[PDB]
């Protein structure tokens with residue numbers, strides 16, 4: 001509700017690229033490169049990523065596990081998916097606890 | 106936020122699939138009853154709906170039986186997406202509308 005930066009924050013692609021895993025036994029970095037673009041992502045060897053090498057990615061798609069920063073995916077995927085993930089998580093915890101309520105609210 | 110215009114007059118909407126993909130299990134599954142019941146009950150269709158031979162007129166309000174029918178229609182595999190008027194898409198300014206809101210619970 002406060003759109004605060006997650007503690008466990010997970011990285012997300014900024015475009016629709018291809019995946020390239022690169023690990024020099026220091027930093028496990030995963031590049032995401034398009035046809036006319038490219039950018040890498042500095043990632044720690046600890047948190048396991050969700051995308052296997054060579055795979056195709058989508059805009060704002062999560063590369064690693066953990067909560068997604070609201071503003072981050074906002075300027076990536078779009079406002080549509082934003083609303084979605086927001087309410088989806090709130091209902092995640094609420095439904096988990098065993099309290100049902102309409103999404104409208 | 107107050108209901109002012111009974112109809113804002115927008116065309117926008119959001120679809121809400123009844124299928125939430127199970128993680129580590131891959132294969133998609135139907136959102137258990139309470140989940141769907143909490144999203145489609147007291148709603149208003151944004152567009153026409155065809156499946157199982159019965160037709161849902163655009164602008165038809167939903168009740169328990171309605172959402173249950175959609176559930177069955179999903180299980181049969183005739184529908185997945187659910188076009189509805191959301192409080193978000195609502196163009197009512199400084200408030201909301203009827204069609205975009207729903208049933209007074």
Ligand SMILES: [Zn+2]
Nearest residue numbers: 113195202205
């Ligand atoms: Zn409205």
